[PDB]
Amino acid sequence: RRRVVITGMGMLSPLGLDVPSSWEGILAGRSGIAPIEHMDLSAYSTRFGGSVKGFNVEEYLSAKEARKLDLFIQYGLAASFQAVRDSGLEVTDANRERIGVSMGSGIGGLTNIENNCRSLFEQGPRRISPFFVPGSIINMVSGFLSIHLGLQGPNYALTTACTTGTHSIGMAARNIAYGEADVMVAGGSEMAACGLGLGGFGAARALSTRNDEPTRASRPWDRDRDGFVLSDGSGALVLEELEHARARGARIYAELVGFGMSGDAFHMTAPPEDGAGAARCMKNALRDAGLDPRQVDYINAHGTSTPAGDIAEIAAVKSVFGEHAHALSMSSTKSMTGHLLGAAGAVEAIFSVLALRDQVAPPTINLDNPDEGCDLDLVAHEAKPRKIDVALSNSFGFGGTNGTLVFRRFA
Amino acid sequence: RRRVVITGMGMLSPLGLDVPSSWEGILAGRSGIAPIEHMDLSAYSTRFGGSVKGFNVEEYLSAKEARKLDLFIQYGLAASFQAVRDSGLEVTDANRERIGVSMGSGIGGLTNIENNCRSLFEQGPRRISPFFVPGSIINMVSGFLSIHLGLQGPNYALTTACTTGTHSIGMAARNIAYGEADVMVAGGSEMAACGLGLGGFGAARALSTRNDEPTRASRPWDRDRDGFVLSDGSGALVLEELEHARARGARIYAELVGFGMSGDAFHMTAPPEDGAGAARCMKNALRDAGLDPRQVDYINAHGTSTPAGDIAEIAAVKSVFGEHAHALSMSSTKSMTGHLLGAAGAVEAIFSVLALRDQVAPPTINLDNPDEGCDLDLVAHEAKPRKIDVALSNSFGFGGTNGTLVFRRFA
Ligand SMILES: O=C(Nc1cccc(C(=O)O)c1O)c1ccccc1
Ligand SMILES: O=C(Nc1cccc(C(=O)O)c1O)c1ccccc1
Ligand SMILES: [K+]
Ligand SMILES: [K+]
Ligand SMILES: [Mg+2]
Ligand SMILES: [Mg+2]
């Protein structure tokens, strides 16, 4: 098993059109949530969310290449191209077989699907776009990235709702550790803010309806939370074998030392109150990393601002970490970004690596009145400079699908 | 790295509602393709496909449980429950943490998506079903299976178009080899025969339009092929660590010895004419298995009945296998079943294991006039009893995403 490091990163989020802009918002405690302007939601129960603002796909692709592609693919490609540029890696005939891709999505091309269904119902099947299928199916992020950059290694795509970006990064790391690849571009992307998306989640009563104050909507572990905030964007990491990164003089942000999974096997959307599945997942990830719970300094929580979800994670952290639960810092950056679904674990793995780089825990904004038992250091309200040698990122997603990543300062 | 064996299998296909019925059709050279009766396609350019005929979800779930679920989830669960029953494994508090799930889908709940879009456009967002999202998103096969059986191990879902079932099985095997699990239920499911699906693929000109003779439509490597046939169904395998299977006295069908991946990085739907990516994938899988190409007896091809696709695989087999390309037998069971997309690699991994069990290569039906260079033993027309110690199953899917599995008689 070879060591795996992070050498490039890329992002579109509700806080910015790249990583440094996003992270500057994060550390300032800025909200990226606002009334949605890209469509008319006056008929809907939730009318706000986390949108990517001012994205120009022409920075990344020709007009010819871009018109075929759903926004979730456009966003995954943007993050991907940023991460490859940031890495400095040169792709050649000598290494292309050894560079793969694993970009995922929770729901994929819902906008294109809705628009092609309109054509179908109103006009007939021959009005469907000839690019509908390739521009909309989930594995075409990985497909198009590999074609655009000539990447010939392992090529696949995860779809695990809120855990997508976490699993994608973890499994890509396993590719590298196993010797299937030397480099992987991994992460996720999502653009589910169409009528079907907001309508669908609203019908399931999953979303906050705090339409009067959108920036106060996402409030993880706060007694007045009322559901998650739907957000859009992408994240991508360049994962690299350690000897390969060193031989080319790559800048190394951090090491990816552990990856853990479990299933709650409990309920379609609420975890058990004791967070038993989440606990097993975190332990699995710590043990994969060869770390004791006392070695953990920062956790970037799943923390979506849901009743059952948020408290289960508090219970799970207490179970795993014992008295040390009170020494570590845990925060939910979803307090500012909302829930990017398939891209959540990607952008949050980035925020974890950057907490390492900058020695600072990002805040949980809006944490005005912590609920019963929510008495840990949840970094309420403002960023906390502190020693961080080891950072976790948790994703405890729809269906009870759990993943945890463990990153460490590189030495 | 621990050894991984196959101890149970399950399926819905166009040939049958379980594995033995399907396989009996396969060995008889029966076509499962017919005009579609479940919806009116008189407005469409392709009006036939491979449908699951006479499925009764009540054999598997209560009416309450089933009404929430898209057919692709119903089908994945059916195959899954069959495979667990076939395995004989008892799930307990002692082993549940060690049993996981990886069921995938290429497109997922397209029928539910279309129906909820109608409600949206005609009536408004509050008419969307409250079960739309959990009953339609791809990871809910794995989610619902884990909740129904209490499976607490690794829980995730692949989405890689035609390669989905292959990757799902391969990666699940890696879980077991790595020690993340002792048992995985793996495979895929698909029900893309709605208006959006047939319309979408027809707009992309991907489908045969041989409406006058549907059973003659799917004709891999035949000079008069004109596109793939869309088919529905599911497959699932119970994968198990070898010591665990032996300790309980499990019946072992075969061993899963290798798994390989690559990306063509060439084109959104056509592979390169020389099948260079497919060759690398097969070599990767053989090398993972510690096998020489001369040890291969049977290949269950990708062979979807497309111009570019089918010939690339012939070129790739010649490249990898040299003169031995003429000694092995290769067939495309899609000649009878059509292309089950995300379920293709699952049902075809099953057919590969059964070729091992029964010492017989299934036929490529309709192979009347083999195209230029298609001069291998493609098992044209009728089944061929022969020695088979090692069987490959290939999936060379949309975006250039390739996967190969290697199974061997167990000793
Ligand atoms: O498209 C970008 N970069 C890019 C695209 C394809 C390949 C590379 C590469 O370095 O190999 C790249 O940097 C890009 C555009 C805007 C901001 C950052 C990266
Ligand atoms: O539902 C089936 N079986 C089933 C469902 C849930 C658990 C088990 C089990 O053995 O643990 C099972 O066999 C079933 C139904 C028809 C045909 C084959 C299996
Ligand atoms: K997280
Ligand atoms: K196959
Ligand atoms: Mg560059
Ligand atoms: Mg049983």
Author numbering:
A (entry chain A), B (entry chain A): 3 to 413
The authors write:
A potential target for antibiotic drug discovery is β-ketoacyl-(acyl-carrier-protein) synthase II (FabF), which is one of the essential elongation condensing enzymes of fatty-acid biosynthesis, a highly conserved metabolic pathway among key microbial pathogens. During fatty-acid elongation the acyl-carrier protein (ACP) substrate transfers a fatty acid to the S atom of the catalytic cysteine of FabF. FabF requires a catalytic triad, which in the P. aeruginosa enzyme (PaFabF) comprises Cys164, His304 and His341. An unusual feature is a completely buried potassium-binding site that was identified in all three structures.
Unexpectedly, the potential ligand did not occupy the active site, but difference density was clearly visible on the surface of the enzyme near two symmetry-related molecules. In addition, hydrophobic interactions of compound 1 contribute to the well ordered mode of binding. Adjacent to the divalent cation-binding site, the hydroxybenzoic acid moiety makes van der Waals interactions with Phe83, Val86 and Val151 on one side of the ring and with Arg128 and Arg129 of a symmetry mate on the other. As the binding site is located at a crystallographic interface it appears that it is a crystallographic artefact, and binding of the compound in aqueous solution cannot be concluded from this crystal structure.
